[PDB]
Design a protein around this nucleic acid. Structure first.
Ligand SMILES: [Tl+]
Ligand SMILES: [Tl+]
Ligand SMILES: [Zn+2]
Ligand SMILES: [Zn+2]
Ligand SMILES: [Zn+2]
Ligand SMILES: [Zn+2]
Lengths: 162, 162
DNA sequence: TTGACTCTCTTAAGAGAGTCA
DNA sequence: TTGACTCTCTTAAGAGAGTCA
């Protein structure tokens, strides 16, 4: 098992490497009709990605470090949270992009929460539109809005009441 | 099946059978500290479920009818929408429970929308809490709230900015 | 020890189709 | 014809692990 010092060193080498990713400025909706700016540190689209990083899926990467001849590997966005509890309320903790930008590995753009909380940020009105998340959103969710419903509630007869 | 008249006959037969399901009253949060009341028509927990209905999964059912001697089968919640486009913006249309009650088959609790719109209703603040869905929600989403984030955005060094 | 690939799995909102009687 | 079971698949937010040099 890695000591807490070894984990800290893993987190430090991860931050060192990610800090050299290309930094892209994105203008984003905050809610309430406001505009804000996020700076994402984006993993490259193709190899090489950076020391310790490899792509295991179209938008999935892993970080790998070998310590005392033992290979350790983590999901690439989970590394900032290696000193945190890994579950809550019986649910696994997941890396959650506050910037909604999968390639971004900026730890200031990530939080550590259940998959349901993670997903729900897709529909949040944003920090200036009424977000109620205790760890506040950085932007309005990309899927927030009136939606595109094709057909609403309806019946042909009179068998039903709401 | 194929013709419009045949499709109307399927919707009417479905409504007649579901109109005989047990009607269960559920009191629900509306948002804004308000409460409302919904009447769900709930498919039975075990066989028999009703004429034409069979369970294909723990919370999945199908409706089956024999038309021109050929069996036609649909997901049990899709029948009200058989005359609607089955996609929108290149996304499949799905039956979306406004009451968030899978066993309910009340078509006044169903709409027809992309899977993303469907999912997002889980986190909607509700019709009295700021819902912006064009086809309005019937209740606050069961997952709306501050969340239970274990760790927020953080860095150990000074390589990152928001 | 390291890079660049390969594969399958989880979750919770949803689906389609076959085997018997 | 109808009922009651079986099985796997889709999506988009997320994961773990093997092989080879
Ligand atoms: Tl997310
Ligand atoms: Tl739903
Ligand atoms: Zn970012
Ligand atoms: Zn939020
Ligand atoms: Zn209902
Ligand atoms: Zn809504």
């Amino acid at each position: 098992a890695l000591t807490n010092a070894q984990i800290l060193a893993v987190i430090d080498s991860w931050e060192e490497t990610v800090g050299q990713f290309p930094v892209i400025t994105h203008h984003v909706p905050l809610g309430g009709g406001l505009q804000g700016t996020l700076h994402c540190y984006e993993i490259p689209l193709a190899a090489p990605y950076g020391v310790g990083f490899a792509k295991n899926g179209p938008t999935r990467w892993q970080y790998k470090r070998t310590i005392n001849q033992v290979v350790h590997r983590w999901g690439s966005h989970t590394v900032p949270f290696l000193l945190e509890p890994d579950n809550i309320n019986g649910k696994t903790c997941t890396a959650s992009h506050l910037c909604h930008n999968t390639r971004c590995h900026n730890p200031l753009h990530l939080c550590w929460e259940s998959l349901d909380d993670n997903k729900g940020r897709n529909w949040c009105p944003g920090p200036n539109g009424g977000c109620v998340h205790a760890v506040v959103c950085l932007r309005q969710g990309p899927l927030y809005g009136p939606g595109a419903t094709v057909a609403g509630p309806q019946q042909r007869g009179s068998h039903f009441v709401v």
